[PDB]
Design a protein around this ligand. Structure first.
Ligand SMILES: [Ca+2]
Lengths: 24, 71
């Protein structure tokens, strides 16, 4: 299992990367 | 999470257009954008995502992570 802090961070970072990469 | 957004994220992170996200991409994300994560915590977050240990995250695994509600 993942703590909710870590799971939330994981989801956040994945989306940040997708947004960043879309941008170039 | 809107499934449209989820599908767009998956497409962006599938670098080889093979229908999966390689675990290296996740490792990269956690190592570079993460805040002082240990290597074991990074490996744990990877394992939490890639649940079959295939070294690739398929769309079902991706959806499970991203759309899960634990409340
Ligand atoms: Ca997998």
């Amino acid at each position: 299992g993942l703590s909710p802090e870590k799971k939330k961070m994981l989801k956040k970072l994945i989306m940040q990367k997708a947004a960043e990469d879309l941008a170039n | 999470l809107d499934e449209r957004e989820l599908k767009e994220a998956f497409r962006v992170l599938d670098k080889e257009k093979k229908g999966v996200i390689k675990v290296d991409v996740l490792r990269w994300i956690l190592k570079s954008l993460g805040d002082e994560l240990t290597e074991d915590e990074i490996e744990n977050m990877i394992a939490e995502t890639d649940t079959d240990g295939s070294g690739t995250v398929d769309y079902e695994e991706f959806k499970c992570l991203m759309m899960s509600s634990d409340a």
